[PDB]
Point group: D2
């Protein structure tokens, strides 16, 4: 169209304001390259024979897939080569990766290189999740520097490999959506300064765990099906990939839940590279993100791979649920 707002440009201009080393741009710019490479391998994964196990288990017990490994090498290498990072945390690595001194920059990046594992083989939409923190310490970089609360985030978001490829990016001022254009391989701004509705009509949870749910979730779900005021019941949606279910929740509004259950005190989703980035996006969009007892973004992690319940979405729906928990406490 001959004037093209790309994620690359939009980023200079934003951080142009606060005169900067500009290495955030180099960082985000390297992450896009990793995102396009993953998007491309995923669009042809059965032709490239990329579905299957790799033959290892990761620290949180996931059966690793070939695409986990490809997308993880891709993200690690482009992050290093950006000269903008010093500590990397990934779902797929037991410990934090410390960047070699020549390539160090001031940022720590937590990421899930491929989220949605149960959905790879059936071609359901899948994604990549990331959060970026500035290094706070003066000490030599270490795993410690990844142990900050989600409120310290400077940038967060995700790539969605859906019917189209979208890069959702949240920073201190707001949330912006960029769609990948396959013909020129740029990320193009499509939604500016996104805000989630005050209240939704959709609830998204895996109801197969009904037997393990706490009484607050149980009551809340029953209320979504049998409204007390005789309003229309909520529709149910659970795609089964966090990135897809959170993304719909952002665009259409509503609520997404992966609560603590009887079996899991801490839920299943991982705090550093699933829960915090999603909660940061939601908060920057005007929504909320809570365990049922406290804000996800205030938790000080003690383990890079720790888990957390999460309930996120429109503020009115998330608040109604918080009240049920307070009512039971």
């Amino acid at each position: 169209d001959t004037n093209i707002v790309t994620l690359t440009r939009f980023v200079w201009e934003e951080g142009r304001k606060a005169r900067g080393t500009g290495e955030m741009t180099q960082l985000l710019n390297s992450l896009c390259t990793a995102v396009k490479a993953i998007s491309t391998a995923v669009r042809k994964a059965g032709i490239a024979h990329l579905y299957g196990i790799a033959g290892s288990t990761n620290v949180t017990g996931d059966q690793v897939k070939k695409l986990d490994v490809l997308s993880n090498d891709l993200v690690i290498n482009v992050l290093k080569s950006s000269f903008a990072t010093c500590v990397l945390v990934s779902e797929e690595d037991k410990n934090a990766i410390i960047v070699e001194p020549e390539k160090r920059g001031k940022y720590v990046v937590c990421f899930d290189p491929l989220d949605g594992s149960s959905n790879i083989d059936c071609l359901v939409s899948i994604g990549t999740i990331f959060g970026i923190y500035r290094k706070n310490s003066t000490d030599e970089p270490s795993e410690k520097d990844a142990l900050q609360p989600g409120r310290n985030l400077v940038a967060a978001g995700y790539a969605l490999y859906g019917s189209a490829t979208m890069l959702v990016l949240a920073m201190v001022n707001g949330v912006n959506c960029f769609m990948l254009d396959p013909a020129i391989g740029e990320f193009i701004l499509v939604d500016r300064d996104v805000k989630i509705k005050k209240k939704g009509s959709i609830y998204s949870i895996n109801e197969g765990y009904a037997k393990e749910f706490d009484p607050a979730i149980t009551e809340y779900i029953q209320r979504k099906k049998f409204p007390p005021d005789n309003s229309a019941p909520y529709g149910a949606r659970y795609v089964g990939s966090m990135v897809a279910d959170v993304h719909r929740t952002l665009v259409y509004g509503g609520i997404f839940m992966y609560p603590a259950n009887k079996k899991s005190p801490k839920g299943k989703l991982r705090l550093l590279y699933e829960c915090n980035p999603m909660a940061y996006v939601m908060e920057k969009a005007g929504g909320l993100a809570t365990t049922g007892k406290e804000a996800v973004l205030d938790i000080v992690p003690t383990d890079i791979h720790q888990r957390a319940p999460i309930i996120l979405g429109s503020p009115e729906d998330v608040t109604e649920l918080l009240e049920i928990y307070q009512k039971h406490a």
Copy 2:
């Protein structure tokens, strides 16, 4: 790789056996071209400004979307130009389209040009559904020729615009999956002669209608959450696009339900271009497809736009549900 099994080749060879006019190949071959064009517009739909209403209502009351209109023109035109069709039924047209005499062939094609409407804007996977019948009558072609039971189907299947684009094709001998390769725009065979597991671990239904469900569905869902034998409960998945939920059901096994409810005697999904094609795929894959009272494929339609409950999936799961209905009858 220099030997390429494309959907085009695989089709000559199959129908090569029964020496043929070969116009089925011309037909399926034209449908691929429509499928690649739709796949391409969908991958860049927000950049092309293709999300939104068109500003009409279709015969079954859907709020029409720009992509409904594009994908529907694309399918109509390529079907005509194939010289293989005489009657077209589409979700988006009040009546059957009769093909102009110069372009007539012996096939009637029912299709949903873009399925998954609620999922377009949030980038969730979406699709195209079709079923092909031979003309049975000697009369001038008419809407009548689309009114055959699903058992008369000669070919059926769907395109899935997911993380990758897949063409699932069922014919008298079996079901085969072809993945679109974006670099050369061919459909490449990836799964040969697919069979669905005897029994699954996943149930897929919109539980927001709990208040309208009949007692058979209600009991069946409660049994999936609280197993009587104390086996692990089923996981829940509901993407919200028929094509995506059926596809997962085909690959991983399990069950998919869009049952009659108190509000809808006939359910919501449409018999000619949603229920029959999916039920034909399932049956050709070794699964089942029933209203709760009879086989989808035996219903003789009386209206091109009529609806039908549908419950489809692994034979063991679909049978357990049928028993509950018999138990209540």
Copy 3:
């Protein structure tokens, strides 16, 4: 645009007229798949490390390149699998390939799988050339069936991997250009029934052989630079890939020459899979194609790999040259 004239459709309709086995369509349709695969590997050849020698010499003494080998396997396999061919002649194979009995069809296809070898590494436009003959004999298929004059051709043309990818196709009624659309991988009709100008302003020959040229070529070139009537001199163009130089000659008009020289009685270009297909295109376009002494299309070959001088182009320019040769004879 929702009505798409593809090479696939245009071919059914043409041969629809003369009711046919339709295996020409299957043939041309398989050749497109090979053409898109080659087009794709060529667009990324330095990234895939596809420039270089393969490490063999072919029958006419060419230093073979990796891309020669890839494009040649691709063309052989798709031709076989089309069930439309019984004898294949390729630049890259010492002898004619006889197709295994199960896959036999009635066509013999001569082809140059990758033309333009000197131009691969410098990214200059390159191509694929082919001619198709019906089998005339009743004998078991043999190399003999490829030894027919170019006038027996039923179809001929070329793919050009230039700034865009074009498939030029000549058949009994005329010449049509199809451009490959990278987004949907179809060949789309762009120029219908092409005709070359009666007279051009461009001459295309490698003038580095001035010392070996016969006196007819020498005089003709001097006349192009110093017109006797004081008209503007012709411009010179020599891309150095037959497919590119012939294609420009077709579109803009003019003349292309690879004449016999003192060193080569028969010139360098190869009769079966370079000279005949190009001469058939030219003649179907209203131009001419001659050795300097006789029509290329009338030569009865005695060797699948024999060479022939060729001078082709607008009829007025090619005739002026023929007169010079008659004048010298």
Copy 4:
């Protein structure tokens, strides 16, 4: 491959050394986006109906084409939005474009947005040419700042839309080739620190102007055809697009000539955005670039649209020609 040297990365690292504002990277990075957009429109130009005149004449008398206009808007807009430029000179604009104050940076960029005009319609390879100078003056930016000799260049090069898309980039330390990967839309390093052979075997000139050539060119051409030492004659190549002929000359070696003629005292190629960028590339590659009487890079321009003879290539060939001119002087 999971480690990807892109033009983007390679540029940070180079200019990383000399700690910088980094706006050269932003500049080159914006130019790539323009280059991919042009590459994409050119690959489908006949399907998009992009061949034809626009219906104007530019300052140096060229009949303007639709693609001239598209590629020129694309380059202007991405240059502005980079915040790295203050003065733009383009073939297609009568005067220098002064950038609006908010978007000013320190660089002046001269460019030919689409070179190769005679070759667009016949699908011959075409290109984009550019040279970048730092602003030297303290005055408000003006056309004056584009009037520097080619020796002041900080960066120069070209995009080639050939069988593949290549970005050739010359800077103070050397010349590097990046190939565009269509699947991820990045420029990937393929040739590092390119050097042109000391001596070639190819001469590239439009011999249709034989009647207007000076006696030095005439003798030089005759020597290429009739070697005095009885070595093999040079091959001739003239694609007819400067970018293609210069690129081959860089890779294979040899010589390229667009000399002053009797009709044109200054030749035809344009100094600011054709001759200088090409001469800078050549010199950085170890070759030479001369008018026949002086180095192209030393000419102080007096007019943004002035023309210059140019003879460029391997140093041994270019020197032999210079000697002929000295011999005639």
